[PDB]
Write a protein that binds this ligand. Structure first.
Ligand SMILES: Cc1cc(Nc2cc(N3CCN(C)CC3)nc(/C=C/c3ccccc3)n2)n[nH]1
Length: 263
C-alpha cells in the first residue's frame, strides 16, 4: 500500500473489471484509458501508463506515480473525478490509477461538438458552480498540481450533468493561473467559444458589446443581469495582473451568490 484510504487492486481484479483491457475510452499524453465495471457494478475509468516494461520506467517515474496517488487520495470532492484505487504490478508491468466513470464525457464535447442538443442556462450555472467548488477545495488542500491541465477537455459530466474536474495525466502552476483558467472556462460556458478570445471579449469589457452578442445563441433566453454578474466574475479572474485576481474562495463565494446553488 502506498496510501491510506485508497484500495490497492490486484491486476487479476482489474483484468476482470476491464475485460482483459479490451475497451478503450481514450488516450492521452501519459496514459491509456480503459472502460471497466467492478463486481460492485461501479463503473470505472482505468488510467494505465504507456510503459510496458520495467526498463522504460525510471525511479523518477515511480516516485511521481506514488506522489500523484498520495496527492489525489487527499483530494475527495463530489465535483472532482476521484481516485477509487490503483494497481502496481511487475509481472506484467502495470502502473494504473482507477477513477470514477463520468457517463456524459467532457464539457468540451457538450459545448462544441454536439450540434443537435445544447446545455441550457441552468445546467451551465450548475456546471460553473461545481467547477468553482472543486477548485476552491483543491486550493484548501494546497494541491493545484492536480489542475496544471485544467480546461473544458479535462472537466467531465456525471449522469445528472454535475461537473467533475479531473487530473488523469501521470505527473511527467500558481493558484493565480488556475483562477484565470477558471475565468476562461466560465467565459467558454457562457459564450460557446473556445481558443481555436481575450481580444474578442475585451470588446465586451471595453463596453462595445451587447450581452445578446456575447452569450451562446444555443442557450436561447437568459436573465440579462445574471449574465452581467457572471461576466464580471470572468473579468476579475482573467485580469492581466495575477496579483489583482480574486482568490478562488472569493470566486466560489460570488458564484454561489449569483447562481443560488450550494455545494
Ligand atoms: C477518466 C474518465 C473519463 C470518463 N468518461 C468519458 C466518457 C466519454 N463518453 C461518453 C460515452 N461515449 C460513448 C462517448 C464519450 N468519453 C470519455 C473520453 C475520454 C478521453 C480522454 C482523453 C482522450 C480521449 C478520450 N470519457 N470517466 N472517467
Amino acid at each position: 500500500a502506498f496510501v491510506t484510504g485508497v484500495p490497492s487492486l490486484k491486476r487479476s481484479e482489474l483484468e476482470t473489471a476491464c475485460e482483459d483491457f479490451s475497451n478503450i475510452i481514450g488516450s492521452t499524453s501519459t496514459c491509456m484509458l480503459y472502460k471497466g465495471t467492478l463486481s460492485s457494478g461501479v463503473e470505472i475509468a482505468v488510467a494505465s501508463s504507456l510503459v510496458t516494461s520495467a526498463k522504460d520506467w525510471s525511479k523518477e517515474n515511480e516516485s511521481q506515480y506514488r506522489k500523484k496517488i498520495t496527492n489525489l487520495s487527499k483530494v475527495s470532492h463530489k465535483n472532482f473525478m476521484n481516485l477509487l484505487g490503483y494497481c502496481e504490478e511487475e509481472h506484467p508491468f502495470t502502473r494504473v490509477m482507477v477513477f470514477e466513470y463520468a457517463p456524459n464525457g467532457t464539457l468540451f464535447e457538450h459545448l462544441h461538438v454536439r450540434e443537435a442538443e445544447k446545455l441550457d442556462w441552468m445546467a451551465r450555472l450548475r456546471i460553473s458552480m461545481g467547477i468553482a467548488y472543486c477548485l476552491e477545495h483543491m486550493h484548501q488542500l494546497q494541491t493545484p498540481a492536480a489542475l496544471r491541465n485544467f480546461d473544458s477537455t479535462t472537466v467531465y459530466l456525471t449522469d445528472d450533468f454535475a461537473a467533475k474536474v479531473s487530473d488523469l495525466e501521470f505527473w511527467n502552476p500558481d493558484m493565480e493561473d488556475i483562477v484565470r483558467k477558471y475565468g476562461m472556462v466560465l467565459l467558454e460556458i457562457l459564450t460557446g467559444r473556445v481558443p481555436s478570445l481575450e481580444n474578442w471579449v475585451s470588446r465586451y469589457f471595453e463596453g462595445g458589446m451587447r450581452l445578446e452578442e456575447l452569450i451562446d445563441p444555443s442557450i436561447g433566453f437568459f436573465p440579462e443581469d445574471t449574465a452581467r454578474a457572471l461576466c464580471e466574475v470572468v473579468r476579475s479572474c482573467i485580469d492581466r495582473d495575477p496579483k489583482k485576481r480574486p482568490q478562488m474562495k472569493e470566486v466560489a463565494a460570488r458564484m454561489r451568490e449569483i447562481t443560488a446553488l450550494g455545494p
